[PDB]
Amino acid sequence: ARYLGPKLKLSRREGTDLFLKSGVRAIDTKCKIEQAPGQHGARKPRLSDYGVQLREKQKVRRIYGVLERQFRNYYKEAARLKGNTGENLLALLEGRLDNVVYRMGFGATRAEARQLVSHKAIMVNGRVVNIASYQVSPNDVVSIREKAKKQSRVKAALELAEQREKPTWLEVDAGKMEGTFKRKPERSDLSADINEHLIVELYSK
Amino acid sequence: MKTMIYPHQYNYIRSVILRLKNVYKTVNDKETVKVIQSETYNDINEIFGHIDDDIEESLKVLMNIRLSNKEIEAILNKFLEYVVPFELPSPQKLQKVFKKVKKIKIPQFEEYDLKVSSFVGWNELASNRKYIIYYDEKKQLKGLYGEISNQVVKGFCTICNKESNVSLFMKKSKTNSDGQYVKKGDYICRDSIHCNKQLTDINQFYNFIDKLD
Amino acid sequence: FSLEKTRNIGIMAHIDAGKTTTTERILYYTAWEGHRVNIIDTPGHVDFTVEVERSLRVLDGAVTVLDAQSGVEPQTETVWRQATTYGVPRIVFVNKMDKLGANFEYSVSTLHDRLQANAAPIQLPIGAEDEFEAIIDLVEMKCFKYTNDLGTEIEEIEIPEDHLDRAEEARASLIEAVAETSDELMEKYLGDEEISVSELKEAIRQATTNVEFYPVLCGTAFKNKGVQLMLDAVIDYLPSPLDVKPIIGHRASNPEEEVIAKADDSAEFAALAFKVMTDPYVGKLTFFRVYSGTMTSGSYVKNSTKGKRERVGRLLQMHANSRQEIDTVYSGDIAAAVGLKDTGTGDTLCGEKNDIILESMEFPEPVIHLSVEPKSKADQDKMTQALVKLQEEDPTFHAHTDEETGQVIIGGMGELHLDILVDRMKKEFNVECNVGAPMVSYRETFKSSAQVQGKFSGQYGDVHIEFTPNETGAGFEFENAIVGGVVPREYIPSVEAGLKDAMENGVLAGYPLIDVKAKLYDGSYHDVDSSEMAFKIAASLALKEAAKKCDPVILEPMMKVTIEMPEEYMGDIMGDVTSRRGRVDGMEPRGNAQVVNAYVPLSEMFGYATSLRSNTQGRGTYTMYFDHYAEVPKSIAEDIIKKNKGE
RNA sequence: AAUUGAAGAGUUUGAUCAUGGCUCAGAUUGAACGCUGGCGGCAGGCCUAACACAUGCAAGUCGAACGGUAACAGGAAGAAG
RNA sequence: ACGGUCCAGACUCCUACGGGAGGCAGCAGUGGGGAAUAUUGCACAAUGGGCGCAAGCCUGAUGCAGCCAUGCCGCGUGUAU
RNA sequence: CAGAAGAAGCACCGGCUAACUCCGUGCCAGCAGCCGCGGUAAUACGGAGGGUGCAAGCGUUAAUCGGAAUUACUGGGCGUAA
């Protein structure tokens, strides 16, 4: 249900950094990002139309660490919700507590954030939540547990978050380690690299 | 030290023990039993040469008409300890054994199998070739690769002299510029491991290889 | 009935020893004197020794029935040996005292001579044949005279003066025999001290239970005399489940751990199924012996052998002709349960939480093999089902279909054993089948050499092959002697393949051709017309032509047989070997036995074990090994050819 | 507010366009089978023989309708160690 | 008129041979058939039903438990370096 | 409270269809939904390395609808293709 395989290999196949590492060292230093994974990885085949759509969908899943069944269900909800399906889907993925914890900077990587959530180190609105899939509503307050405040990783993660660009939608307080989701992130606010249209077309196929 | 009984010898010992056990149940005459018991004792003594107390005890148990199959199994296990497993050559050696067969691969063989096998034979289904390796009388390793017939028939196997499912095994003489060659063969067991367990005489197998030559 | 008052006995005898009748009389007279007696009737015939063996395994005691006229017969010796193997305490009951030529003393002497058993009479008969009227008890020094034919009126009288001296002498011999096993009795015997009846009985009982002494009784089941005294002896001398050594089993989880199942009602339930029977009224009946614990009707039990949970619907206790449903079975008891679908003979039944496996009975491998062919295909299907059911009932019966010949081979412990099963198949399952000895593996060869040409004619293939007979056991040799590319090298493998295929299918009766040399020396090809198939066919045609010219013959396997026997029976065996087309190679004396080495066809060695046993009175054994293949006689060869060609 | 909805591809020819059948990519299941198998919540589970059914259980209740007391648990009375 | 009556029939069963008994397509379960489908569980605590003045009694309805990856959903099998 | 401890497999990689080479085999053994592949340099057979897709599942089979405007009401046609 969770992918425990090498994180960088995923990035190599996509051909772009998936931010699956801390970023303390450059991805290029850590691995040959340019080369695709495998013996025949150096060879670049022409990408088929199905391939282009697949790779986009895979990229998003790999970034957010969401399995197909769950990702398929999100698409259906995004379609069901009024508005641009692509934008809705991306917002839903962002709404996940796992992403929220990472974006707040409590976790260095989304996987690390998952461990914190999974191991009941994170509280939302004063109730402990161990669900990564949990959707953080606007005006909800997410704070690390006091027991887990002492953990060194979280403090280091905050420092790594300082290096990263700070989301407008999430307000975070250091030391207090409390963050409020003021608004759902706008599509413009979300990274432009992800192309929602390709994902929508693939599922429409 | 433990007698280094050959694997073929061990197989023979098992058979005579089974006969002796059969004799106890089968025979209703005490005199006949006594003759068989003496025979069995003598035969085992000859095979082991000097007999340790453990062999002596086992023989005593074997001689007793109250001998049981469970006891036999334990006796066989003890005798198995006396047995020495068939040596396996280094992979480099294997390639030297079959230089003509480029990148020849040997499958894993059980140590127990080695212990109960006088010779090692592995068959490649794709090539329809069975490869047999055996240390000669000089103890030099000898490897033969021969075609095995896909058809299988029930007939007395040449190698073990025991009736089983067998297929014709042909060894090819070196070809010449003319392209003349001679293939000589006789039916052998498709399963080498079963054959090894069946075989009770190393000489019979030695002769069989000579027949192929 | 208490455990102490329970007796589990089995009746063993030779054929026509009055064994069954003895059982009938017992049941007629009976529970006896406040004791429970469970009886298992074992077969008398040598072919059903397996039934005896299983019975002996589960029994605590046994009664040997002998014919007063015959004494110890070969069957008696066999069953005695089986009972010795399992260490079953036993008593000897002389039967057919009324039979003309009845001799009690002779019968006792044969026990010592043939079995070398420490057996002494506890009773002496008065009269023999039609004059047999009374029995002297040596333990009590009393005489019991039967005044009626029904044996319901026994008069206890003083030992007649004419037999009193005999009785005293016999008693002294009895005491001496028992004293050999008892130090206390020996001291009294040597000191000429008076041994009380109770002390003597206790000493006999101990000796009997230890399988050190065998009390000998006399009587006639037919005339209803001595059966009640034998029952008294069963109670007095034969052990209870408590007296016998407790059965040892192993845990299913830990085979190395030995667990001893002692006879206790409060212990964990453990039972052994020793007999399964199909009943019209109740369905499948499984007879089982409870060694420990209790089991209630409607309870759930675990087959530890199979690791399967089963439920016992009902518990059936046998009562002669009548049957009784019981609610609970206790330790030491033998009873039948209904509803055990998966339970077979030899399986251990225990509590759901228990994992004890009692020592299973080992079934012998079949000694005789016969081929069974159904008259119709519909009968084949019925036969298969019948064979399965019979195999389920009897594990010593093996039935399997030979994949090569398509013949169904049946294996059994005896010719009668197989004949019964065949008869059952015909009667019970209405299967018409023909039974014969399984066809022996046969090989063909050439006697003469010949050069033959195989031509196939575009499609073109021409080959010239010289076939020569090879030495016996030299196998097949193919030589490519083509020079100058008369036949393209690409087609040589095709020629070989065609030959090999044709050789495997044979030339005469369709048996593989062996010990032949084929030399391809010449041919011809067409550049455009030649194909691989053409040359393969041409090679096959060549073999057919060779078959016409090379004088093919059929070979049969010759077995080297070593027969060990007494010198007295050598003459009969030698004649028997010769009668089976066998040749004696050598004869060597070994101790008191004579060893004969001979070469006999495997085809003639079917049923040799039985013939040997008959010829040597079961004192001879043989070992056979494959030596070589030899040409079959012309008369047999023609019959084989006819059989295979469907002529 | 109760909408948001609509993908083709391979295969007839030397090659082509059309026609036309065949095949595949999706979704779904009371499923079955093979290989494999951590936990939890929720739901489902004889489609076949409307085949034959061992055994227990699934329909009783009312003494506030009535004669009674078979019990039993008492009471009273009378005899009692 | 599922766990009522009568008759006839097929089946199974009892019998003193005269005459009798029975109907799981209620629950659990067995045999059989089939590629294939669950325990002869617990409780009437709640809901609902029958009878009762009520207490209560009865309730395989029902509430629950057992078995099964059969499905749906969520989660894990570490995570940074 | 102890300790990463106790917890990953299945199908697929000629084109359709995302995913490739090597070795063995030699119109054989085999594969296959379709088109087809295999006769000694097989990304199509079998195995290995590597990869893709899914994941406590993954394939296969059966069954229904879709793609099929291929019964066309929505929404087809009838000179020569029916």
Ligand SMILES: CC(=O)O[C@H]1C[C@@]2(C)[C@@H](C[C@@H](O)[C@H]3[C@@]4(C)CC[C@@H](O)[C@@H](C)[C@@H]4CC[C@@]32C)/C1=C(\CCC=C(C)C)C(=O)O
């Ligand atoms: C009751 C007893 O002790 O033995 C019975 C029981 C008996 C041994 C029977 C003879 C024979 O079918 C037996 C065999 C092995 C026959 C082959 C199979 O079908 C077996 C499953 C079967 C089991 C026992 C059985 C059914 C008996 C005999 C022997 C009859 C003697 C002769 C010469 C034919 C008997 O009753 O005398």
Ligand SMILES: Nc1nc2c(ncn2[C@@H]2O[C@H](COP(=O)(O)OP(=O)(O)O)[C@@H](O)[C@H]2O)c(=O)[nH]1
């Ligand atoms: N004369 C005589 N015949 C007997 C006696 N006991 C049994 N028989 C008969 O001898 C035969 C023996 O057969 P059976 O009782 O089946 O015994 P089995 O053959 O040993 O199993 C039967 O016909 C019996 O009736 C006896 O004491 N005297």
Ligand SMILES: [K+]
């Ligand atoms: K088309």
Ligand SMILES: [K+]
């Ligand atoms: K209720």
Ligand SMILES: [K+]
């Ligand atoms: K229209």
Ligand SMILES: [Mg+2]
């Ligand atoms: Mg899941």
Ligand SMILES: [Mg+2]
């Ligand atoms: Mg009898």
Ligand SMILES: [Mg+2]
């Ligand atoms: Mg009703």
Ligand SMILES: [Mg+2]
């Ligand atoms: Mg009913």
Ligand SMILES: [Mg+2]
């Ligand atoms: Mg039911």
Ligand SMILES: [Mg+2]
């Ligand atoms: Mg079935």
Ligand SMILES: [Mg+2]
């Ligand atoms: Mg009730």
Ligand SMILES: [Mg+2]
């Ligand atoms: Mg592709």
Ligand SMILES: [Mg+2]
């Ligand atoms: Mg190749």
Ligand SMILES: [Mg+2]
């Ligand atoms: Mg349509």
Ligand SMILES: [Mg+2]
């Ligand atoms: Mg049209």
